Amino acid sequence: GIQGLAKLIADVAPSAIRENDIKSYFGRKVAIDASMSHLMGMFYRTIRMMENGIKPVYVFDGKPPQNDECKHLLSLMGIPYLDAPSEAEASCAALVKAGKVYAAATEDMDCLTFGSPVLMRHLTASEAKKLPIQEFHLSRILQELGLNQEQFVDLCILLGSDYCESIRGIGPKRAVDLIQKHKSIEEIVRRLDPNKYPVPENWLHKEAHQLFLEPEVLDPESVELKWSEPNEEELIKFMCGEKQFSEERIRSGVKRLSKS
């Protein structure tokens, strides 16, 4: 994730966020961060997306920087999936950049840091929760803050990312001000009072910066994404016979999947 990024954007770049009903994404292809998003839950969430005309492609994590059952269910449902070489949401970003999908879907705000033009949050949320889709457009963030992607990456590092520490005591609004004035973390460190704001020791901000800018990602052109009809009998057999889920529950969902 990126700590505080969503709230910060709502505060200082509100035009970059839109809250939309799930119904409004009819016909959209969406790349889903499979790890952030168990079999019955995937079954139901995917059906809910398909009922609304959304065509999801699930992207699975590769090796981190430094599931066979789920894939079986997706194949039987007619839902495509991809193995990312590394972080799934970075490959989701690549699929958006390449025009293969409309948006990336994940709760991980660092999908924007990896450069995704569009990020949709809460798509995988259960229908009961009543959460509207939270949709971010990266270009609007950069335009509102007057930053380029490199500067945005350093801001996200200062906010707090998965891959390195942040500067203790530097708040989100303050981090924006520092990035706007100084452009890079290297310059910020020259200008900060070490007596007031000491930086972490052995700080890996350069390494994290390079990871966000040049992540290892799949090639969107290698696999043509396809959505097809489910294998209903095999689906029942696997989910009910092997995985002990309710035959009535599965049949109801399968019926809905075909009807959509």
- Give the annotated binding-site residues: 33, 45, 61, 87, 89, 108, 110, 160, 162
- Cβ 73 vs Cβ 80: under 8 Å: no
From 32-40, 123-131, 180-188, 226-234, span contacting K ion (CB under 5 A): 180-188
Question: Does position 83 bind Mg ion by CB under 5 A?
Answer: no
Residue ranges in 21-50 that form contacts with Mg ion under rule CB under 5 A: 35
Residues in the chain: 260
- Interface map 92-131 toward K ion (x if CB under 5 A): ----------------------------------------
Annotated binding residues for DNA, written as ranges, equal 45, 87, 160, 162
149, 203, 204, 243: residue in contact with K ion (rule CB under 5 A): 149
Contact 25, 55 (CB under 8 A): no
Least distance in Å: CB of 244 to Mg ion? 29
Beta carbons of 27 and 51 less than 8 angstroms apart = no
Binding site membership for Mg(2+): which residues? Answer: 33, 61, 87, 89, 108, 110, 162
| CB closer to K ion out of 48 and 209 | 209
7 membership: H or E segment, kind and range:
helix 5-12
Least distance (Å) between residue 87 CB and Mg ion: 5
Interacting residues with K ion between 55 and 84 (CB under 5 A): none
Distance of closest approach, residue 181 Cβ to K ion, in angstroms? 16
Which one, 9 or 92, has the nearer CB to Mg ion?
Answer: 92
Is 24 exposed, middle or buried, given 0-12, 13-18 or 19+ CB atoms closer than 10 A? middle
Please enumerate in sequence order all residues whose Cβ is within 8 A of that of 161, keeping only pairs 6 or more positions apart, or say none.
Answer: 1, 2, 3, 110, 113, 208, 212
Binds K ion by CB under 5 A, chosen from 28, 55, 121, 209: 209
Q: H or E segment at 231?
A: none
The contacts of residue 62 (CB under 8 Å, 6+ apart) are 83, 84, 85, 86, 87, 88, 216
CB of 255 to K ion, least distance (A): 34
Of 194, 126, 196, 112, the C-alpha closest to 157 is 112
Contact string (CB under 5 A) for Mg ion, positions 149-188, x = contact? -------------x--------------------------
| Phi/psi at 96 (5° precision) | -65, -45
**Residue nearest Mg ion (C-beta atom):** 162
- Which residues contact Mg ion (rule: CB under 5 A)? 35, 108, 110, 162
